[PDB]
Amino acid sequence: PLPPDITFDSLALIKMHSQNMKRILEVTLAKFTVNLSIVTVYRYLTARAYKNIEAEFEILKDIYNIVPLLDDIAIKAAQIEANLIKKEITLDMEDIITATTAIYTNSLLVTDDPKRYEPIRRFGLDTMPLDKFIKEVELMVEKEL
Site for a copy of itself in 13-42 (CB under 8 A): 38-39, 41-42
Tell me how far, at minimum, the Cβ of 132 lies from Zn ion, in Å: 30
Kindly tell me the number of DSSP H helices and DSSP E strands found in the chain.
8, 5
Which one of the spans 88-96, 103-111, 117-125, 133-141 is the region binding a copy of itself (CB under 8 A)? 88-96
**Range list of β-strands (E), 25-138:** 33-37, 65-67, 108-111, 127-129
Are the CB atoms for 5 and 35 separated by under 8 Å? yes
Residue 19 is given by DSSP the state S
Is 9 known to sit in a ligand binding site? yes
Pick from 18, 68, 74, 139: which binds Zn ion (CB under 5 A)?
68
**Which residues of this protein are in contact with Zn ion, per CB under 5 A?**
68-69
**Which residues of this protein are in contact with a copy of itself, per CB under 8 A?**
38-39, 41-43, 45-50, 53-54, 57, 61, 68-69, 71, 74-75, 77-79, 81-82, 85-86, 92-94, 97
